[PDB]
Amino acid sequence: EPLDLVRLSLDEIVYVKLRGDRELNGRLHAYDEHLNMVLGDAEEIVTTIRKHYEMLFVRGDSVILIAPPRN
Amino acid sequence: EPLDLVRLSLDEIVYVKLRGDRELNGRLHAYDEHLNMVLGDAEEIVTTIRKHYEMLFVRGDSVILIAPPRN
Amino acid sequence: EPLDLVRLSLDEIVYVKLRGDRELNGRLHAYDEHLNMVLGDAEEIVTTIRKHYEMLFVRGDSVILIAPPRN
Amino acid sequence: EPLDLVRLSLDEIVYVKLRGDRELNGRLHAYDEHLNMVLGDAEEIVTTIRKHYEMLFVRGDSVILIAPPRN
Amino acid sequence: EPLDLVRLSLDEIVYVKLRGDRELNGRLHAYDEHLNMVLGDAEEIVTTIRKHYEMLFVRGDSVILIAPPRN
Amino acid sequence: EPLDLVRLSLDEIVYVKLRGDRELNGRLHAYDEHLNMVLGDAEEIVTTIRKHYEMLFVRGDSVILIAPPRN
Amino acid sequence: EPLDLVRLSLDEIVYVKLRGDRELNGRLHAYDEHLNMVLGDAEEIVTTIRKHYEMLFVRGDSVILIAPPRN
Numbered sequence: 088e089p090l091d092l093v094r095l096s097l098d099e100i101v102y103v104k105l106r107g108d109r110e111l112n113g114r115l116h117a118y119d120e121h122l123n124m125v126l127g128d129a130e131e132i133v134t135t136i137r138k139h140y141e142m143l144f145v146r147g148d149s150v151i152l153i154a155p156p157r158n
Numbered sequence: 159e160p161l162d163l164v165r166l167s168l169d170e171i172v173y174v175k176l177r178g179d180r181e182l183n184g185r186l187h188a189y190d191e192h193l194n195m196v197l198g199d200a201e202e203i204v205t206t207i208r209k210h211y212e213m214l215f216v217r218g219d220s221v222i223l224i225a226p227p228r229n
Numbered sequence: 230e231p232l233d234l235v236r237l238s239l240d241e242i243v244y245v246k247l248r249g250d251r252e253l254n255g256r257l258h259a260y261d262e263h264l265n266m267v268l269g270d271a272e273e274i275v276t277t278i279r280k281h282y283e284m285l286f287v288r289g290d291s292v293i294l295i296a297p298p299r300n
Numbered sequence: 301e302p303l304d305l306v307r308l309s310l311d312e313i314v315y316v317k318l319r320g321d322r323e324l325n326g327r328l329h330a331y332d333e334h335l336n337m338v339l340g341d342a343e344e345i346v347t348t349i350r351k352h353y354e355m356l357f358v359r360g361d362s363v364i365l366i367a368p369p370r371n
Numbered sequence: 372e373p374l375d376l377v378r379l380s381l382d383e384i385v386y387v388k389l390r391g392d393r394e395l396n397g398r399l400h401a402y403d404e405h406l407n408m409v410l411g412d413a414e415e416i417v418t419t420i421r422k423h424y425e426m427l428f429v430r431g432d433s434v435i436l437i438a439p440p441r442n
Numbered sequence: 443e444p445l446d447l448v449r450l451s452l453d454e455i456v457y458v459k460l461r462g463d464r465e466l467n468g469r470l471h472a473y474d475e476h477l478n479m480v481l482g483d484a485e486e487i488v489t490t491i492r493k494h495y496e497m498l499f500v501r502g503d504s505v506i507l508i509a510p511p512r513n
Numbered sequence: 514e515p516l517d518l519v520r521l522s523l524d525e526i527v528y529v530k531l532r533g534d535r536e537l538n539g540r541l542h543a544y545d546e547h548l549n550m551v552l553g554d555a556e557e558i559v560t561t562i563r564k565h566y567e568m569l570f571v572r573g574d575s576v577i578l579i580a581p582p583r584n
Binding site for chain 5: 123
């Protein structure tokens with residue numbers, strides 16, 4: 088049930104809050120049971136210093152929040 | 159028995175304290191054995207900077223307290 | 230044996246010390262093998278800023294000490 | 301073999317060092333495989349602010365050292 | 372699926388963000404289920420003090436992000 | 443193979459570095475698979491405030507380094 | 514595959530980065546699946562205060578990086 092939110096966000100642009108002052112935005116291309124994700128066209132925001140990635144692998148362990156697009 | 163409190167809070171508005179100066183309020187739409195939750199119409203409060211989400215996935219690992227709505 | 234202390238505290242008012250400058254007092258309504266608890270009429274004390282809850286779910290992982298009421 | 305030390309200290313007054321500036325002294329009434337303990341007539345020392353408990357449950361995870369009384 | 376990104380990066384030059392102010396760049400020679408990696412011709416950047424290694428073993432546990440080379 | 447060093451140190455005086463500014467010296471009387479030890483005639487050094495114990499139980503989880511006596 | 518690097522470093526002089534400002538250099542005499550190592554003629558560097566050991570046991574849990582000698 089709770090993971091349904093991540094699953095319905097496949098190919099949508101998600102917001103991800105990681106542990107310790109880091110955030111991401113990107114298109115969810117893939118995820119797994121551990122909450123590992125691959126984000127496409129991703130922006131990383133340390134707070135502000137930004138960084139952009141064509142493809143980004145995010146380690147599940149460090150994910151705190153995931154929000155789908157308003158849509 | 160203790161998880162009964164989370165279970166009876168399905169569709170109620172819960173308060174959630176996370177690790178490290180973060181709090182949430184939202185409608186509990188879903189949870190699992192790991193204490194992962196989906197919160198609807200959720201407010202995040204870092205302390206104070208606020209943020210609002212239509213739908214929010216919260217990682218169970220970071221949950222310290224959950225309080226149901228009063229009455 | 231050691232968990233007997235928590236068990237005999239069912240419905241008594243317990244003191245709970247959590248990781249990192251947080252404490253609780255409340256009536257133990259429920260607990261489980263992970264040391265998750267539901268505390269009734271609970272006070273949370275960060276040190277001092279206080280907060281009160283009619284019903285509180287506490288995540289076992291963060292519990293360091295539990296003391297039953299005196300006598 | 302190493303746990304024998306804790307076992308032989310049953311009913312003796314043990315010193316316990318916990319993670320992060322905390323110490324205990326008390327009569328070992330019970331312990332388990334996780335190193336959870338119940339300490340009787342226990343003194344807690346944060347360093348110095350002291351606190352006393354008639355009975356105290358200590359979570360095993362946070363125990364770093366245990367010393368038995370000097371015979 | 373998400374690990375596919377690491378797998379398709381075999382022999383490419385990857386960027387790796389580790390916990391706590393450390394980054395790496397190097398040629399991915401090997402990885403495993405734990406996300407342990409061996410990086411060839413690797414640069415380590417603490418932030419800035421740099422360090423270079425002909426071959427580097429990175430512990431999986433400390434990996435937060437992995438980004439494959441562009442284009 | 444690596445644990446052989448701990449095993450050959452039985453009854454020798456070992457140095458032990460724990461997490462977070464703590465060190466021990468003592469006679470290794472016992473150890474287990476978790477790296478729990480009992481140290482005899484042990485000195486604990488926080489850095490410098492020292493403390494001495496006739497018998498000391500050390501929790502394996504917090505052990506970083508173990509050095510056997512020279513020769 | 515990734516552990517091959519550690520394995521091929523048997524009897525070579527390796528550099529090891531541990532968690533939290535600590536480094537080691539020594540001759541790799543032994544290692545195991547957990548990444549526990551015994552380092553011979555080892556130097557420990559906290560950053561700078563140095564320390565030397567004839568034989569050193571290193572707990573695998575705290576190892577972040579391992580680099581074999583050049584060529």
